[model samples]
Target: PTLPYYQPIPGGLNVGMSVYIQGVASEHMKRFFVNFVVGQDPGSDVAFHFNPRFDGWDKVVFNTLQGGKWGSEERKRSMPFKKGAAFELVFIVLAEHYKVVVNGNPFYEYGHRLPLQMVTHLQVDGDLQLQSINFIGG
Candidate 1:
C-alpha cells in the first residue's frame, strides 16, 4: 500500500490473455501506476503502463516504454476510482491492443507498441492496497 509491489506472471503472456487486479486506493493517495513489463529486471521494456492520478481529479494515463525510454503519454479524463474505495481492474490482451476495464466497465484501449507476448512481469507502486493480481487463461 505504500510503494513497490511486484508480481511475476505465471504461464507467461499471449494474445487473449486477461489480467485481473483488485485493490483499494490509499486514503491519502496522490497517484499510482501499474505496469506490465517485459521482465522483472530493471530497465526492461514496459508493454503497458496504467496510471491513475488522484491529486486533482481522476485521470488515467497510458503509455509504453522501450529501451528504457517512455513513449508519449495518453490521458483519459475518465476516472472510475476513488480514494479508500475498492476497484476491480482488468486488462485483456488483443492482437493489436490491450482492452482495459475498471469495475466491470470499459476503460480504455492501449495499442500494442511492442509484442504482447514479451510481457512477463506485473509491477505496482504508489499508495494503495492490492488485494490480488491474477492471470486468467492465456
Candidate 2:
C-alpha cells in the first residue's frame, strides 16, 4: 500500500507496469514536474516527461505547445481529484505509446521515444495520498 504521496523505485520502470497517480497540486505550485529519466540520480537522466509549470505554462492543467508537438492537447485532459475523490490511473506502455486509462477510460497517450529508455524507478513528487501500486512486468 502507498501512503503520503512519495514512492521511489531507485532502479527503473518496469516493462509492463502502468504508472498511476491520484492527487492534487497547489494552485500556485510553481514547478510540478513528472520525469521518468534513465538513471539512478535525479539530475542525471533523460526522459520524456510533463510538467504543469514548464510544459503547461500557457495552460495550467493542459498544454498546447508540448501537446501539439507530440500529438494534440485534446488527448491530454486533466481531472481534478475531488475533495475526498479517489483516483485510479493506469498507464500501459505499448509498442509506440503509453496508454493512460483514467478511472476507466482512455485518458492520455504518451509516446515511447524522445531518448527515454530506462525508468527503473517511479516517483510521485507532490502532496497526494497513494492508495496502492500494482506492478506487472514480463
Candidate 3:
C-alpha cells in the first residue's frame, strides 16, 4: 500500500504471471530495493533482489539470497531510474528467469536462483514512494 511495501502474492507465481509496480524515486534518494522474497523474516531467502543506488556507484545490483547469504552480484553499469521521477516497473515470471521491464521497455532478465514456487512475497523498501502494486495474470 505504501513505501516499505510488503504484500503476499495470492497464488505465488506461474509461468505467465507478472507483477506491476508504480513508484517514485525520492529526490536525493541514495538507494532502494525491490525483492521477490521466499520468507518475510529477516535475512530470509530472496529469489531476486534488485537494488538501485544513486551514490558513487550509480548502478543497479541484482542478486539472490540463499540460506541467509547473498549470491554473486550482477551489476548493471547504468541506472535507468532518475531520481525524483516516477517509474512503472514490471516483473514477468517465466520458467527460467524473471523479465524486468522499465517504463514499458524490456530491461533485464534475472535467472531463477531460487525456485519460483518458493517466493511468496514482493517487497519494496527504502527511498521511494510507492504508488501501487498489482499482480497480473495467473
Candidate 4:
C-alpha cells in the first residue's frame, strides 16, 4: 500500500474477520496512522483510529470519530513500532471488540465506539511503507 491509501472492505467487517498489514516505519518518521472508517472519505465516521507518534511523544493513540467530531482518546504509553523496522499488524474483528496483533504478538484491543457493520474502508497514511494488505476470513 501507498502513503495516504484507502481501500474498501467490500462489506463491513464481521465476527471472525481479520485484516493483515505488513509494513516498515519510515526512517525519518514523525507519525503514522491506520483507520477503520465508516466510508471512503476522511471526514466520515471512523470506528477505529490506530496512530503511533514518534516525533517526541512515543506513544500510540486510539479513538473514534463520529459526525465530523472525535471522541475521547485512549492513549497507550507504549510503542510497538521501531523506526526503519519491518512489522506485521493484524486487526481481528470479534463480537465485542477488535483484537490487535503486532509482529505475531498480542498488541491491544479496541472496543467498538460505533457499530462494526458501519465500517466500510481501511485508510492508512503518514510515514510508513506497506508491502501488502489483505482481508482474511469472514
Q: Compared to the true structure, candidate 3 yields what TM-score?
A: 0.96
lDDT of 3 by residue, 1-138 (tens): 766788888799888999998999889799999999997888778899999999886898999989878889998878889999999989999988999899988889999989999888888899988888999997
Which residue pairs in candidate 1 collide?
none
Better of 1 and 2 by TM-score: 1
- Per-residue alpha-carbon lDDT of candidate 4 for residues 1-138, written as tens digits (9 for 90 to 100): 676789898667999999999999999888999999898854799999999999676898999999999899998888999999999999999989998898898988999999999899999999999999899996
What are the runs in model 3 whose C-alpha is more than 4 Å off? none
67-133 per-residue lDDT for model 2 (tens digits): 2253233323354233344656666766576666757777667666543245544545543445566
Q: What are the TM-scores, per candidate, against the unseen true structure? A: 0.92, 0.59, 0.96, 0.95
Best by TM-score: 3
Against the correct fold, how does model 4 do in TM-score?
0.95
Better of 3 and 4 by TM-score: 3
Candidate 4 residue 91 C-alpha distance from true site, Å: 0.5
Report, for every candidate in turn, its global Cα lDDT versus the true structure. Answer: 0.86, 0.49, 0.90, 0.90
lDDT of 1 by residue, 10-43 (tens): 8777888898988998888888889989998879
Q: Which 10 consecutive positions of candidate 1 have the poorest summed lDDT? A: 1-10
Note each model's CA RMSD in angstroms.
Answer: 1.7, 6.0, 1.0, 1.1
How would you order the candidates by TM-score, starting with the best? 3, 4, 1, 2
